[PDB]
Amino acid sequence: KVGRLIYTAGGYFRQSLSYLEAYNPSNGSWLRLADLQVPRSGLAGCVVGGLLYAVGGRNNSPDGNTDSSALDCYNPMTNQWSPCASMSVPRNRIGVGVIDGHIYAVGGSHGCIHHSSVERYEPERDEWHLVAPMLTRRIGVGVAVLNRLLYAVGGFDGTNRLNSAECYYPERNEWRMITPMNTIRSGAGVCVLHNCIYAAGGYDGQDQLNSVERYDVETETWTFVAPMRHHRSALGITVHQGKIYVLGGYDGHTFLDSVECYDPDSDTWSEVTRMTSGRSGVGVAVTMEPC
Ligand SMILES: O=C(O)CCc1ccc2ccc(OCC(=O)NC3CCCCCC3)cc2c1
Ligand SMILES: [Cl-]
């Protein structure tokens, strides 16, 4: 379990960013690592087999806005990024989950298109294939995996921000609605901790949120837990050693540098560190420290 860092990739502040930075919860230190080949915001990060993957997003720059179909792989042993097979379609404001070594890319936008499509990456073959689409088009969707089931939570369908959520059952290649959240949330941080799917922050169509709710997959209920110190939309999120970490986002005024940590045993949030600069729309995941 030792030696793991929280990696943050990409993001947005005035334009899309290429930063790869890694935080060590054990000593508070931050490292700046190899830049992404292409700056991207609205991407997702995940880890398979010790490799960090950056999936999708958009490059916003003064010279254009290009939605990304890219899958890129970072190896901490070499501090190098390598291109992987690209997705069938660009996906900005994507959600990603991993089941049994396979990456699922969910939703996202391509220009004015709001995707319901979903595709699955096989690292051993370096191939993507489409799977069943969701029941709802969703961008800014939160995705997490619990007990080898894939959840897609909230988002924006092109007309309305959503409180709905749905679950993908891989052995039936089928999506089913689950109980909707109590709050409409687009751009929430969604993760899994113990037996619950957590949805932190987001935008409800009127304000950035500090509220946090969790779905118990056995009881099928959503329950609020302690709110974050900061309202945040387009935040990064991950779980590490039994605690949720939220990174950055937008509070309606500032692009935040704050990182908060949720302890489920005390039901409290604490501010633990600051990123090197405020930013939103980052991809976050946890893997071994680099060499
Ligand atoms: O339209 C809605 O309902 C809300 C839209 C939404 C939802 C999720 C996002 C996730 C990442 C993401 O990255 C790029 C990103 O930070 N952009 C913007 C968000 C922060 C403030 C405005 C300027 C930058 C964007 C997202 C946008
Ligand atoms: Cl861990």
Curated annotation (Swiss-Prot):
Q: What is the effect of changing residue 12 to A?
A: Impaired interaction with SQSTM1/p62
Q: Where in the cell is it found?
A: Cytoplasm; Nucleus
Q: What happens on changing residue 58 to A? A: Impaired interaction with SQSTM1/p62. Abolished interaction with SQSTM1/p62
Q: Which residues does the record list as S-(2-succinyl)cysteine (modified residue)?
A: 291
Q: What is the effect of changing residue 186 to A?
A: Impaired interaction with SQSTM1/p62
Q: Which residues in this protein are found as S-cGMP-cysteine?
A: 112
- Knockout consequence? Early postnatal lethality caused by abnormal cornification. Mice survive until weaning and probably die from malnutrition resulting from hyperkeratosis in the esophagus and forestomach that cause gastric obstruction. Defects are caused by constitutive activation Nfe2l2/Nrf2, leading to constitutive expression of phase 2 detoxifying enzymes. Mice lacking both Nfe2l2/Nrf2 and Keap1 reverse the hyperkeratosis phenotype and are healthy and viable in normal conditions.
Location of site Sensor for electrophilic agents?
112
| Primary localization | cytoplasm
Q: Where are the Kelch repeats?
A: 5-50, 51-101, 102-148, 149-195, 197-242, 243-289
Q: What happens upon changing residue 93 to M?
A: Impaired interaction with NFE2L2/NRF2
Keywords tagged on the record: Cytoplasm, Kelch repeat, Nucleus, Repeat, S-nitrosylation, Thioether bond, Ubl conjugation, Ubl conjugation pathway
Q: Supply one GO BP term.
A: negative regulation of transcription by RNA polymerase II
Family recorded in the similarity comment: Belongs to the KEAP1 family.
Comment block on domains = The Kelch repeats mediate interaction with NFE2L2/NRF2, BPTF and PGAM5.
Q: How does it assemble?
A: Component of the BCR(KEAP1) E3 ubiquitin ligase complex, at least composed of 2 molecules of CUL3, 2 molecules of KEAP1, and RBX1. Interacts with NFE2L2/NRF2; the interaction is direct. Forms a ternary complex with NFE2L2/NRF2 and PGAM5. Interacts with (phosphorylated) SQSTM1/p62; the interaction is direct and inactivates the BCR(KEAP1) complex by sequestering it in inclusion bodies, promoting its degradation. Interacts with NFE2L1. Interacts with BPTF and PTMA. Interacts with MAP1LC3B. Interacts indirectly with ENC1. Interacts with SESN1 and SESN2. Interacts with HSP90AA1 and HSP90AB1.
Q: What does this protein do?
A: Substrate-specific adapter of a BCR (BTB-CUL3-RBX1) E3 ubiquitin ligase complex that regulates the response to oxidative stress by targeting NFE2L2/NRF2 for ubiquitination. KEAP1 acts as a key sensor of oxidative and electrophilic stress: in normal conditions, the BCR(KEAP1) complex mediates ubiquitination and degradation of NFE2L2/NRF2, a transcription factor regulating expression of many cytoprotective genes.
Please report the name of this protein according to its UniProt entry.
Answer: Kelch-like ECH-associated protein 1
Q: What is the lineage of its organism?
A: Eukaryota, Metazoa, Chordata, Craniata, Vertebrata
From which residue to which, out of the full length, is covered?
323 to 613 of 624
